[PDB]
């Protein structure tokens, strides 16, 4: 998971 | 109430096959903060799926740690719904978290898989958030  | 520590909300994206920009759901309040589902095409190619928290606020003092289950509903069989989990400390510089390649675009849009109907796809988020800091002092 990560930032857009 | 809006102070609830957790909630499950959904957002249905219409004209999905034609999606070309990021789309945001209306807000669901948890811990009195606005949480939203963000969907965006990534490279057609893949469906991007992120959870956003308190992005509108000009505040740079807030933070909220939360865990969540991001799921794309399979209307033909819920056990076929696809989900991924996240754990993240949300704050102004990292106000959203998720996967740019949550699912293959070809799979979600496959008319025989059960995720799309009338060019609509439903996204769901179950978020469990801790008490935020730097907000309602």
């Amino acid at each position: 998971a990560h930032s857009s | 109430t809006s102070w609830r520590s957790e909630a499950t909300f959904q957002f249905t994206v219409e004209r999905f096959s034609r999606l070309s920009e990021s789309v945001l759901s209306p807000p669901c309040f948890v811990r009195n903060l606005p949480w939203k589902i963000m969907v965006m095409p990534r490279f057609q190619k893949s469906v991007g799926f992120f959870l956003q928290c308190n992005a509108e606020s000009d505040s740079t003092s807030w933070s909220c740690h939360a865990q969540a289950v991001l799921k794309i509903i399979n209307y033909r069989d819920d056990e076929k719904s696809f989900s991924r989990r996240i754990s993240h400390l949300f704050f102004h510089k990292e106000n959203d978290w998720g996967f740019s390649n949550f699912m293959a675009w070809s799979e979600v849009t496959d008319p025989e898989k059960g995720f799309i109907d009338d060019d609509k796809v439903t996204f769901e988020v179950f978020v469990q958030a801790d008490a935020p800091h730097g907000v309602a002092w």
Side-chain angles (χ1 to χ4, degrees), chain B residues 2 9 24-37 51-57 62 64 90 95 127 132 135:
Chain B
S2 64
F9 64 107
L24 209 62
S25 74
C28 172
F29 298 86
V30 174
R31 292 297 192 172
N32 204 215
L33 294 180
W35 301 78
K36 302 175 184 183
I37 283 169
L51 172 56
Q52 184 190 260
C53 175
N54 204 209
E56 213 76 271
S57 181
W62 70 275
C64 179
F90 294 75
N95 69 29
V127 58
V135 182

Side-chain angles (χ1 to χ4, degrees), chain B residues 47-117:
Chain B
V47 185
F49 185 0
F50 304 76
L51 172 56
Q52 184 190 260
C53 175
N54 204 209
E56 213 76 271
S57 181
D58 66 306
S59 170
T60 61
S61 64
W62 70 275
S63 69
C64 179
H65 190 281
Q67 292 189 302
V69 177
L70 278 53
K71 173 168 59 181
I72 293 183
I73 301 298
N74 185 295
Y75 80 81
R76 295 182 174 183
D77 184 351
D78 188 57
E79 297 193 308
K80 298 293 185 63
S81 292
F82 190 68
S83 69
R84 294 179 184 288
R85 47 205 168 300
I86 58 171
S87 182
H88 176 66
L89 181 284
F90 294 75
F91 70 113
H92 76 296
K93 294 186 176 182
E94 294 185 1
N95 69 29
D96 76 48
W97 207 245
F99 313 80
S100 55
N101 299 80
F102 184 93
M103 279 187 77
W105 189 269
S106 61
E107 179 177 354
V108 184
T109 61
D110 192 319
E112 300 302 310
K113 296 293 185 178
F115 299 103
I116 194 168
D117 184 56

